[PDB]
């Protein structure tokens, strides 16, 4: 008869780090009984590598060093099948796995290969916002991989705070998600977060109020990382002495535009940046009392909020600001020295350093004699409830990220603010920019983490963007936002 | 002694649709020998559901209807362990799986549960650009799920054509990636794409040149979906008769700005939109001859390219266009009736329909008497080489998407252009907007798919954005792009 030598691998698939998979290879068309059988693998961009071998009976068995102690080759001669039991799998093991036999066929001179079966071991996946130190965090991930053999990927999706609930809710998503604490209550209500289990010794390493920020329904639902608040950033050359009041800003802008510059530019598309002026004279989100936020008591349509917004809109009407300015426009204008001031958090300092602008960081201006009240975020890391990697995620967050070395590597990328880890926060307290962050933070308020926060931010955003644009008056906009 | 009843699940993890996983439950602290043992599961946002049960010896066995025929419960009384062999798994099976025993403990009156082990079966994942019909494609996915039981998710990441090579190269990524054919050559060079295996009967269903667009190194590396080319879109009310030449556009814009409008706005941030004017008088990417693209022969610094770019820059200098206009600015301006014309492809028609603008779609204007030459894209779908779901992806693309019903559902979301499927393209040929798409397409050129395309687009983008901005002259910009 003809040569119908055939090898058919099966059993490949998807598996998490630390998991197990059993491959099989069905052999036909030749006296398999008498042949040594081999497993190989090939990944894209790597050369093919031998993995294991087994003799005819099954009693002699050999392994590559890269899989020794983790894989076991076996065979069943009743079925002419050879098996590769793979344990303690790692991202590095991703590959097409092939079966192979040697020196058979006509004249005993030919080797045969199966078509291959795919094995895919995804990395530990982290999502963090694009304005944070994701390259420094990937360096933390490289150390984790060095120690554990498990690859870590950091991604920064656009709109990640809305994408996580939709894909975690399709049973998928990253293993670890970073965001300010305000969104996490909604994720926990939906059951998309694992409860985290730091012991008491580990809890003592971080400031208690940050733990409070990531407490929901009496449960710790994420690891607090760092405390963020907006600050007034200014060009010490353009403006040696920055103004103390929002009321000074128009005349400063006139003096500056006479010289081809402007006073102030910051992001007007996200209400996080316009909130400190809205809250300053009385605006608030949800009134907190008797240990609960009262969700029927929303302070977005009172006279203080309207006074702050009307002031902002007036700045726009007088062409001191432009309704279309967003994060990138304001950053580019400040770091090129075109505007004397901007409003931002610690993550922005990095880029200013590269800009060579001699800048200072200081207290937000007052409005009607009241401090601006920025909403204070606690950058936090939750473990996806659907993650098949929760123990690895815990090890990463506790023993790699939340260390002096881990936070330093992130902070050297984009500054974190007042880090929750006491030991490193003492080291960083000496920074005048962090001192001004903490001053603005204490004049503000911690964001709530209740599930209504999302809707709240959606309303204020609308109301700001409409009022700045003219589509609605300030009273109309805030009334629509109260609903 | 005390009650130390304990149930410990293990064995959960990540597994692809169609795959298998074996759970185990170690029982201690009670005479397991004599107890019925049960498996349950709970997903977030769903109530807990019973799954299976087994009697004391192991000979009597029962299953929920939702898992009947796919799961097998077993037990080993030497180890006081009960097992759940799960086969033909599906996204719907994602859950925390629990072991349970009933009516034991003191007074035989208590039930005990293990802590649970997570099982995660990800959907089939599709990536497609945000300007395409991803909601219509998700409807195709809903039909697929109805028929197969396998959930489909469509995501539209920002910058997906750059993200796919980085994460497919970390051994991860979506199962199916949509993009114009020009990027796929680079993906295939890197070995990130599966070879696809449509039979001849299926190949005959699509126009041969689209197959040619997704051929690399003699291999079919993706499924062609639809043929895209830019067209001139105009407001029939503002401009009953649109201009035939780029040279007419300044005087039209003066007539229009006297009335508070403008002639033309389109995306100036992506060279795809400025290319047809640059190529028109002679600009080209790579010269093709003797069956190969000559990568040492780049036509980006010749006099035709410079004449097209200088014309564009002149439009900007005379304040007929603004260097900062991108996709969203131009779309909003056209669909609000603020500008008489824009330049775009079939995906944009949907939004104009909602805008109630009475628009027409027609031939791009001529430059120095030559047709504008748009680069013609073939929207294509590749299968990730690392996907553990390649057979499902094939079934989806061939038997769901590439049908009259599948393309119709996508096309009703955002029009596809001239679809590669002959049967549906005959139905759609009657459309005057598709006729003008095909006219502009035949006056243009098919994009190459060689791996250098990426670098090519990176250079032209730079050169356009610099020249429009003033940072560089046109000659300087094109010279930098030739390198
Ligand atoms: O603008 C509403 C928005 O504000 C906050 O987001 C901040 C974030 O906390 C900072 O870390 C920084 O990344 O900028 C964001 C604003 O662009 C809330 O945390 C977020 O939930 C809310 O949507
Ligand atoms: O701008 C360079 C860019 O152009 C093409 O991308 C098009 C795409 O083909 C269309 O389908 C539509 O989505 O718009 C894109 C331009 O924004 C190339 O296909 C792409 O490789 C290239 O980077
Ligand atoms: Mg996923
Ligand atoms: Mg993934």
Author numbering:
A (entry chain A), B (entry chain A): 1 to 483
Paper text:
LPS is synthesized in the cytosol and transported across the periplasmic space to the outer leaflet via the Lpt pathway, consisting of the proteins LptA, B, C, D, E, F, and G, which form a trans-envelope complex to bridge the inner and outer membranes. The last step of LPS insertion via the Lpt pathway is mediated by the LptD/E protein complex. Here, we present cryo-EM structures of the LptDE transporter of the pathogen Neisseria gonorrhoeae (NgLptDE) with partially and fully opened lateral gates. Importantly, we could obtain these structures by complexation with nanobody-based chaperones. Departing from the structure of the previously described macrobodies, chaperones that are built of a nanobody (Nb), and a C-terminally fused maltose-binding protein (MBP), we increased the rigidity of the original linker between the two moieties substantially to design an improved scaffold, named Pro-Macrobodies (PMbs), with excellent properties for particle classification and particle enlargement in cryo-EM.
In particular, substitutions of Val122 and Lys123 by two consecutive prolines was found to lead to a stable chaperone where motions are dampened as proline has the lowest rotational freedom of all amino acids. The mutated model was computationally predicted to adopt a new conformation, where the MBP moiety is turned by ~170 degrees according to the trans-configuration between Pro122 and Pro123. The mutated Mb, termed Pro-Macrobody (PMb), showed strongly reduced flexibility in MD simulations and retained the positive properties of Mbs such as their simple design and their elongated structure. We then transformed Sbs against NgLptDE into PMbs and crystallized PMb21. The X-ray structure of PMb21 at a resolution of 2 Å confirmed the predicted structure and showed the lowest B-factors around its linker region that forms a short poly-Pro helix-II stretch. The C-terminal end of the Sb moiety and the N-terminal region of MBP feature rigid β-sheets that are only bridged by the intrinsically stiff di-proline linker without additional interactions that would stabilize interdomain motions. The specific binding moiety could thus be exchanged without a change in the properties of the connection. Further, the PMbs retained their binding kinetics compared with the original Sbs using grating-coupled interferometry (GCI), a biophysical characterization method similar to surface-plasmon resonance. PMbs are different from the recently described megabodies, as they feature only a single rigid linker. Since any Nb or VHH can be converted to a PMb by fusing it in an identical rigid manner to the MBP moiety, they could become a widely applicable tool to improve the results in cryo-EM, especially for small and challenging targets.
